[model samples]
Target: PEMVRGQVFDVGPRYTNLSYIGEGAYGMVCSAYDNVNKVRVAIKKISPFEHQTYCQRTLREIKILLRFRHENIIGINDIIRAPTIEQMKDVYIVQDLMETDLYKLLKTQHLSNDHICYFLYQILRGLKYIHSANVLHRDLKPSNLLLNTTCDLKICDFGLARVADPDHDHTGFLTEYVATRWYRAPEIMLNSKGYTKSIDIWSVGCILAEMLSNRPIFPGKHYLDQLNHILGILGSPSQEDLNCIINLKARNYLLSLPHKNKVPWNRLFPNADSKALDLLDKMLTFNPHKRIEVEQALAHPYLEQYYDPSDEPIAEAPFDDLPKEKLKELIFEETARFQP
Candidate 1:
């Protein structure tokens, strides 16, 4: 919580500064301890830009949380006012803090077999909620999965997200340059213009693989290598699948791409127990259509055994298709409602 004195607004005035987490495409983040709430919280300092794109993403995040609520997804805990805008263009977005992200946790190699099951369950629950709203969390990676010592996970980051039209909205809403290189599915890397929610499922599959192996399954160093690394394991795309390719150039490249058998599960995750290779096998499919949907992923034996049908993420919520410019204006107006 921020304290305001005179005209100046202080960001998280009552919180103890912890450490600078890192920088994102939009801004930098910090882990701070909230004395007022007496809870650990994360504050991301974002730059409110003249461009609507930045604010568009922020609006979706707010609506997704408040307008459409979910248990497994993160929500705003506190709102802090602007920092010394005279020093820099910074605004605050405070959220419930997690001990660490999945990426760092994997480095420690500390997750137990049960941890894997519970975490994946929570992630699927979160994604199901997001997708049911016709939103696409295009940029998904381990670093974005926030977690704590208690087995809980919240999927954050909505920068690359949009109110996606599943039938491949031809307005060029989907961008091929989405940053999460290693977590991308083959169709995304190959530049499929008309992708759907399955793109996110593919990323979830990568996360599942990493948590099991305690390392990134496809540690693609660059764009070219990212595709090669995946193919090196999943092998060349079949002609049947190739015919569905959207990008002419990407399709031509795939025709000549190298052929290799699916990398052995034992080699990928040697020490992992409570086997569920079948789930990963379906999820990490090269064909986006072949990838399991988040809704269906919940019923996989690995998760279904522990799943409760009553735990569905979708409920009474607001969803209306508005004109682009009009909806943009309304979303912008919603921000004004967030004013403390």
Candidate 2:
């Protein structure tokens, strides 16, 4: 294997060095200096042969990233095709690097009400842009959201994202596990064959809830347990809701799980403002059809009231000074192989 370089690829201005940031099942990410612009950028390099299905996914990600450009979405600095020992094989994507991710920020517990609101609004704005472009960010967890200098958020990691065509049946939807288990929408949880952009909204709801609670709302040990956790807090699905599930692998488990009835948003967020609570309820509704959509979420009163366009610091805290090792321990400990 060829060693990856720290500098920008041939397609863009050169960078002196790049620092490894993080890695996922599909690729590795790094932060590189942009000598031409005098800035830092993120570079996500995915090995073409890592998984047989990843080739098309890599291409799709590039297409989507190229098509959409918004303040809240990560900027694509450049795309490079680096040759490996086997030949002109693997390709890499270079993007604007952010200081950190939402996951790390959340772990630091430095977020204030303003910080939370700003972050959520940015997420909604990014989701709105994606939806407007007819794209669905299938995965919308905190880990995939990056933060720039001013604490502005940018939605990243388009590997699981797809274009949604309202006129067509969802036959092209991939069946293999898509969104992270904790952020998965109910339709996905039910194994529905065909789903729409609403899936992304459900994830937004989960992300919002996580932001408020400072914890994953549904951290199931297994898929079955995940379903149970949702039902335990959100009530059982109606018969009509049950019928919508397609090829459900856990139908029996769904049937056997006891319904604890849904809990109100006020209960979930006792300290949250009414506006925030109201939106949270709307987003996390049990009915996929009833869940809040991206456009509506952006228009919600909570976002309007809390969104701060000014450069003022949203929250007061020393979150940036936390030890990196401690942050890593919290993430691994909290997300120790959740199944749903």
Candidate 3:
């Protein structure tokens, strides 16, 4: 009764019981048995009204979960709320209970070439669908990509995600801090104005390299050190690459640093498949404009076996953002709508 009052509350009766799963930046997570569905579910409880940024992220995550449904993306099973709208402080999201995430799995298991190929294929496939709707999953990393024992993967977390106007492609709409340091794209770290879907592609490259080497590709001690780690392998950006920087200080910073020669790709991953390495080279290109797009990646010879045009579907409509003032009411409505 004590746990019920504190944890699940009114949503308790429908679920057999709730056992603590873990905690995340936004809130606490628990594994619950859904009596109606006769299956297990992961419930994340979050209080959106804490901070302005937290409010936006919570609302953004809920909206994305409500609309985007794909085999390679996490899906919302149900939404639970308090008995009264006035009393509603926390929202409980019921979703598929993934056994673990890529970060945890990679720390323990040694992956085969086949495993790497399939995982990369799925990431691209999911990104194709996401990009189709003009949504940028600004945060993409190993921990966000959850996994099952059978090796099935699903992209999770949307707090930093936003829908971009592909035609405009400007940074005014994006936040200053976007992705995790290691998996973050060079363009983001440089504070470039020309942010785009290609930033996510950069993350995919980092994740792929991690899988191949069995460790983080660029685990820097500080943000500046992070760029050094990237340049150490990727080499210094060319004159044209430096041209992407709009800020004179940012551009000069690159110029002041000694020019470094590019490392031969084969030297880093000598045992990796040539086709895989070729794909990696394209995705990890220094300039975002030069990086490979999702559809092109799916068509690459490295993922040819899994590249089926017909089966990989796109979102029917693009996602919409909520106005700041309307967020609380909108979130309440979304959660209450699912109440049984």
Candidate 4:
């Protein structure tokens, strides 16, 4: 079985850790150096027990990362499980080490328009790849995205990524489950029962604003408070807007607010270019059905230089979650390449 003595992981000595990074939804991460390749890597550990949802999520992440190899998405360099199939308890996921994540960087630095535009382009490009693969990144907050000093950004943490409905025509309580509240879509905030990939677009819009402002555009303490924050900025919904909401209490709840006026987009972001402002407005559109999707945002003149989707295409995935039994088998397959 794979052994762990504090920070170091001994698996044929392929990788070793000198320090711990941080804990993710799956497990605690450590900073390690690859002896063979002579490069530093980040390692996260997941002790897969029966009914471990995080285990399943980790499996899907490995599977998805293995499937799609894009510059803007995280790539799994290796998956080291216990020595034997039955001995498996904790598995290790190895990824390239980056300086910091978007969330951490945002907390410390103010980004210029060039930084904002370029960072946004990379985010959209990554999402475009994921969406094209038919995956819905339910969570698209700052922490989930990784960044390096070169202004390079890669979408990470596929734990919350999965398949979504192609037709976003229907509505339902995406707000409760998807995206961090401040960056959540209006439809989600209003308690829409159903949502699609467009949910991510709304999050990107929030990130864009935050990158420029160096703070969350809408920081709320709770669901109700979050809605108020959005309404305070984007204003209240129309009768027609409320018509699509199937949740009776939600519709009534939305009406609870008496008079809410919106901050004009220009006034909110007077320093932003017209093109960027228009794209942001489209993304933050109240109607999820009308929310600007990846394609539209990429085409916007604001992102023209980086909009070209000339990269060779890959397939979509929310990918089937192999059962626990099959999951073990997947790990067993790695034995063929096992060293140490």
lDDT of 4 by residue, 212-328 (tens): 678899898976677778888888887888897778767888877787877987898778877888888888888777888887788899988777767524454434455677765
- RMSD of candidate 2 to the true fold? 11.7
What's the residue-level lDDT of 197 in candidate 1? 82
Give per-model TM-scores.
0.83, 0.78, 0.92, 0.88
What's the best-to-worst order under TM-score? 3, 4, 1, 2
Give a tens-digit lDDT track for model 1, residues 87-124.
Answer: 43445677888777888889886777788888899898
Comparing 3 with 4 on TM-score, the higher-scoring candidate is 3
Off by over 4 Å in 2: 1-13, 49-51, 82-86, 165-176, 238-255, 306-340
Give the per-residue lDDT digits (tens) of candidate 3, residues 22-126: 787667888888898898888887876756777788888888878898999999888878767678778778888898988987899888889999999998888
Top-scoring candidate (TM-score): 3
- Which pairs clash (backbone N, Cα, C closer than 3 Å) in model 4? 12-340, 133-316, 133-317, 171-194, 172-192, 172-193, 172-194, 173-192, 173-193
Window of ten residues with lowest summed lDDT in model 1: 1-10
- Candidate 3: which pairs clash? none
Assess candidate 3 and give its lDDT: 0.81
What does the lDDT read for residue 229 in candidate 4? 83
Model 4: which ten-residue window has the lowest total lDDT? 1-10
